[PDB]
C-alpha cells in the first residue's frame, strides 16, 4: 500500500539515523579531535562525512512528517531541510568524483600528483566543491512550499510553475548531480583499469616424439603453463609447417629426442621443421628447448643441443637451459613441471601494483547503487512530463511516482554506508593481515592509518 511504502520509509530513515549519525560523527571527531595533522585524504574523508552528517540531521524532521502526517516546521523549515539535502547530494557526488580524479592523476602523471596533492590544493577544491554544491541546489529553495491539503494536513510538496520547470529541474538534478560527475568517474577508472589490463599469454609447444616420452613432457609442461593462465598450443611436429609457425606466440617451447645410431640424429617428425627452422620467425622470440634421451649414449640429448644452437644462431632469445630428461619422463615429473615454472618466471610480465583502491571503488559503487535508480526515475518522470505531462499518476507513472518515494528513503540510507565501509574494509583486511601491524600505524597521530585504508 501507499502507507506500507511509508512504513519502509520510516524504518529506512530511522536505521540510517541509527547507523549514520554515530558513524559519520565518530569519523568527524577522530579527524578534528584525534588527528592533529589533517592530511589530504583525511580532509576528503571529513567533508564526505560532513555532507553525510548534514542530511541525517534533517531525517528526524522527515520522521515527524511521516509520523503525524503533516508538516509543522513552517515554510522556512520545509525550504531549509530540502536545501541541505540537495547540497549533500551534489557535494557527495563531486567529492567522490574528486577522489577518482586524484587517483587517475596519481597513476597517469605521478610527478603532477606529487606536485598538486597538497593540503592547500585540497582546501581549495574542497571549498570549491562546497561553493559549487550550494549554488547548484538553490532551485529547491524556490520549488518547495507547504500547501495545506485535506483537513489539518500540510505537505512539504514540490510545487513548480509548470511541468517544463519540473522537467528542467529533474534533468538538471540528474545531469549535474550524477550523470556528468559519474561520467568523469567511469572514464577515470576505465583508464586506470585499461592500464593494468594485459592480454592472456600465448605459448607454443611443438614436440617430436617416436615412443611418446617427449609427448608426455610436452603435455605436462602444457598443463603447467595452462594452470598459470596461458593459452597453450600443443602440436606434433609431423603436422606443422615452418612458414610463420611461431608468429603470434610470446613463448615457444621446442621438444625433440635424439635418435642417432652412431650419431646425434633428430626425431623423425622433427627433422623437416629443423631444416626449415629459419622460416618460423624465431628471431627475437622467447624460446626454451626440452627433450628426452638416455645418459647411456655418448651425447645426452644431443637433439636439444642442436636445436638450441640453431635457435641461438637464428636470433632467438633462449630463456632457459634445455630440459634434458633421462629415461622414463614420468619418473622425473617434478623436474618437468618445475622447469616449466622457471620458464614462466623467465618471461613473466612485471608484477602489477598490489595496491588497488578497493575502498574508494566501494564508496563509489555504493553511492551509485542508491543514486543511479533515484536519478533514472527523475529522468523517467521528466520524459513523461516533457510530453505526456503526467505527474504523481499515470499507468507506469503510478509505479514511477511510488518508486521515487522509496528511493528517497534509500537516499538517506546512502548517507550511512560510507562510515560502515570505512570500518568494513579496515577491520576486514588490516586486522586479517596483522593485528600488530595495525597498532603501529594507530600509535602515531593517525594519518598513516587512513592512508593505508585507502591503499
Ligand atoms: C514528490 C514527493 C511526494 C516524493 S515529495 O518530494 O513531496 N517527498 C518529500 O518531500 C519527502 C517526504 C517524506 C520524507 F520522509 C522525505 C521526503 C524528502 C526528503 C528529502 C528530499 C526529498 C524528499 O526529495 C528530493 C531530495 C532527495 C534526497 C537528497 C539527498 C538526501 C536524501 N534525499 C531531498 O530534498
Ligand atoms: C635407435 C636409437 C638411437 C638413439 N640415439 C640416442 C642418442 O644418440 N643420444 C641420446 O641421448 N639418446 C638416444 N636414444 C634414446 C632416445 O632418445 C630415448 O629412448 C628417448 O626416450 C626417445 O624419446 P621419444 O622417442 O619419446 O621422443 C636413441 C634411441 C634409439 C632407439
Ligand atoms: C555542471 C556544474 C558542475 C561543473 C563540473 C566541473 C567541475 C570541475 C571539474 C574538474 C575541473 C578540473 C579538471 C582538470 C583537473 C586536472 C588538472 C591537471 O591535470 O593539472 C595539470 C596542471 O596543468 C599541472 O600543473
Ligand atoms: C576526466 C577523466 C580523466 C580520464 C579520462 C581519460 O584520459 O581516458 C578516457 C578514455 O576514453 C577511457 O579509456
Ligand atoms: C567541483 C568543483 C571544483 C572546484 C575546484 C576549485 C579550484 C581548485 C584550485 C586550483 O585549481 O588551483
Ligand atoms: Na551523501
Author numbering: 13 to 212, 1002 to 1150, 213 to 318
What did the original publication write about this model?
BLT1 regulates inflammation-related processes such as recruitment of neutrophils, monocytes, and T cells, as well as smooth muscle cell chemotaxis and proliferation. Various studies, including those using BLT1 knockout mice, have associated BLT1 with diseases such as asthma, influenza, arthritis, atherosclerosis, diabetes, and cancer. BLT1 belongs to the γ branch of class A GPCRs along with the chemokine and opioid receptors, among others.
The hBLT1 structure, captured in the inactive state, adopts the canonical seven transmembrane helical (7TM) fold of class A GPCRs. The side chain of R1564.64 forms hydrogen bonds with the carbonyl sulfonamide group of MK-D-046. The guanidine group of R1564.64 also engages in a stacking interaction with the imidazole ring of H943.29, which, as a 3N-H tautomer, forms hydrogen bonds with both the carbonyl sulfonamide group and the hydroxyl group of the chromanol core of MK-D-046. Among hydrophobic interactions, the largest ligand contact areas are observed for I2717.39, C973.32, and F742.60, with I2717.39 interacting with the chromanol core of MK-D-046, C973.32 with the pyridine ring, and F742.60 with aromatic rings of the benzamide group and the chromanol core.
